[PDB]
């Protein structure tokens, strides 16, 4: 009695055993992470604007994906998703502006050309 822990217990006298290798490793690695959960924001408006641009004869270049990185909470992700939607919306508007200005310039040009052609006629 008392040889296991220094407490002379008459029931449940055994000392706590060694930790498992699994628990030791897991605890030593507390807070560590691997991978992540990808999240998506719809791109359909931006895609349609680029498509419309191509259809109007505008030259369209797709740049590399911008990696916003990784955030630790759903609330940060919702914030960043909102920023992305707003960025897509601005990108789309800018493209659309350019496409409308091109269409107008081309219309104006052909009109002038028609005047000149009628003169040379």
């Amino acid at each position: 009695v008392g040889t296991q822990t220094g407490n002379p217990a008459t029931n449940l006298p055994e000392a706590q055993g060694s930790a498992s290798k699994e628990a030791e490793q897991s605890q030593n690695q507390a807070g560590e992470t691997n991978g992540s959960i990808p999240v998506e924001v719809p791109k359909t408006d931006l895609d349609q604007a680029a498509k419309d641009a191509k259809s109007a004869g505008v030259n369209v270049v797709q740049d590399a994906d911008v990696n916003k990185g990784t955030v630790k909470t759903a609330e940060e992700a919702v914030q960043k998703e909102t920023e992305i939607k707003e960025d897509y919306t601005k990108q789309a508007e800018d493209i659309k502006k350019t496409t409308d200005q091109y269409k107008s310039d081309v219309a104006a040009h052909e009109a002038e050309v028609a005047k000149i052609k009628a003169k040379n006629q």
Binding site: T10, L12, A23, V39, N59, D65, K68, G69, A74, Y102
Partner: protein, 485 residues
């Protein structure tokens, strides 16, 4: 006229974004009443609960195809599969005995909840490991791994709780060993363990209820309700209780209330509650025993246990006269039973001298009994009683008394063996009855050191006034007990 130049074809750029999320986890540790016990203290056998919690899954996520929690549990923590399953709806539970690891997998149902609206964040649910801690002085640490879609993994914070019985506990500065103590003392409070104890003397056994390590305990109500008892397994073959002299005081010197005392001839005579408590504590008293019981476990717990206030029980027990006739040793042992957990005290041993007066003829020579050295109590009575025929023998009125051993007094004075002691005695004579009692003066006897041996002999001068045989009877009284022959 030349045509105008067409408008320059413009170029536009666009790009997409990538984004990802690492939801956090948090392992909580709670007692059976769902009280947070991280870095605190709970009793051996406490139910300890492990809640494996996960932060919200983010809007815009893909469907979740698996949601898995793996928990390598601590040694000495006994996993309860049925209570765990009951506490963990929405998860399938499995368990590896080899690695003491429980795995929770979200059911299809749970996943469907997570997948119902991918456009909004969703709260998770959590499993709860249920089990019991089984060891004294132990620290139980735990964390877990979450894996989502086999593509995201994270390990949680490490929680812990400790059981009483561990010194140098950085979480619990009052934690130390649970060590009930027993000591035997005489009436003046001198320790008399191992000493000779005369028949009729009192053992003022002192029992310590060691509660200091329980300070700031956070056990659940069911654990506390297992109660608080103290047992004295006394040697009933040698001793009789003086339960009326029991005193119970706390470490601040205050009298204790709410603790009742009973004694039982044996286990079978005891009520069922006591048999159950003793059985569960692994304690089987030998024959008769005394038990001290906290009448109100909650009040006792609040007053002395969670406060870490030791108790002292004085339980006096008298040596039976029969032990002076046989001699012999006796042993006393106690147990404290906290939250149903038993702990044994040290064992205290004493011995009783066989006092053997003798009668001789030279004058009847009445040889007194020997009080051995290293005895436990003051001498206050040492008488010679002689019942003579008087038919028979005729008392002259002359007697003498002598020391038969070297006698040491409390001031270091020694009375050498053979020294006449008659001056320290008186005598009552009944010539009609034919009886004489020679009594040592109490003040003299009490001046004798308790370390000293003591023995004296009387010479009683008899003139024979008849013929035939006259039986003579001599009885020697030492303190509270008579010894013949």
């Amino acid at each position: 006229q030349d045509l105008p130049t067409p408008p320059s074809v413009p170029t536009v750029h666009f790009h997409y974004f990538k984004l990802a999320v690492q939801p956090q986890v948090n392992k909580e540790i709670r007692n059976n009443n769902d009280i947070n016990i991280d870095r605190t203290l709970v009793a051996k056998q406490s139910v300890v609960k492990f809640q494996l919690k996960t932060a919200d899954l983010p809007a815009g996520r893909d469907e979740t195809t698996s949601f898995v929690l793996v928990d390598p549990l601590p040694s000495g923590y006994q996993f309860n599969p049925e209570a765990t399953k009951a506490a963990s709806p929405g998860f399938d539970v499995t368990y590896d005995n080899a690695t003491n690891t429980v795995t929770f997998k979200a059911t299809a149902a749970t996943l469907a909840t997570f997948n119902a609206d991918l456009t909004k964040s969703v709260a998770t649910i959590y499993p709860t490991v249920v089990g019991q801690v089984l060891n004294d002085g132990a620290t139980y640490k735990n964390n877990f791994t979450l894996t989502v879609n086999d593509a995201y993994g994270i390990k949680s914070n490490v929680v812990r709780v400790t059981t009483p019985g561990k010194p140098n506990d950085p979480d619990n500065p009052n934690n130390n060993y649970i060590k009930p103590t027993k000591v035997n003392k005489n009436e003046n409070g001198v320790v008399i363990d191992g000493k000779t104890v005369l028949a009729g003397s009192t053992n003022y056994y002192e029992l310590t209820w060691d509660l200091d390590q329980y300070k700031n305990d956070r056990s659940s109500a069911d654990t506390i309700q297992k109660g608080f008892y103290y047992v004295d397994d006394y040697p009933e073959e040698a001793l009789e209780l003086r339960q009326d002299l029991v005193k119970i005081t706390d470490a601040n010197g205050n009298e204790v209330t709410g603790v009742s005392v009973d004694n039982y001839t044996n286990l079978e005579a005891a009520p069922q509650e006591i048999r159950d408590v003793l059985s569960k504590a692994g304690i089987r008293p030998k024959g008769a025993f005394q038990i001290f019981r906290a009448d109100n476990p909650r009040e006792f717990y609040d007053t002395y246990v969670k406060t870490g206030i030791d108790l002292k029980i004085v339980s006096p027990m008298v040596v039976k006269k029969q032990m002076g006739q046989t001699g012999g040793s006796y042993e006393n042992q106690a147990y404290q039973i906290d939250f149903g957990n038993g702990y044994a005290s040290n064992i205290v041993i004493n011995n009783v001298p066989k006092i053997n007066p003798k009668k001789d003829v030279t004058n009847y020579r009445l040889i007194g009994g020997i009080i051995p050295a290293n005895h436990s109590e003051e001498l206050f009575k040492y008488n010679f009683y002689d019942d003579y025929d008087q038919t028979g023998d005729h008392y002259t009125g002359q007697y003498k008394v002598f020391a038969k051993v070297d006698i040491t007094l409390k001031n270091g004075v020694i009375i050498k063996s053979g020294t006449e002691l008659t001056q320290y005695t008186t005598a009552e004579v009944d010539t009609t009855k034919g009886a004489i009692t020679i009594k040592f003066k109490e003040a003299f006897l009490r001046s004798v050191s308790i370390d000293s041996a003591f023995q004296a002999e009387s010479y009683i001068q008899m003139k024979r006034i008849a013929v035939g045989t006259f039986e003579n009877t001599y009885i020697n009284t030492v303190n509270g007990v008579t010894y013949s022959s």
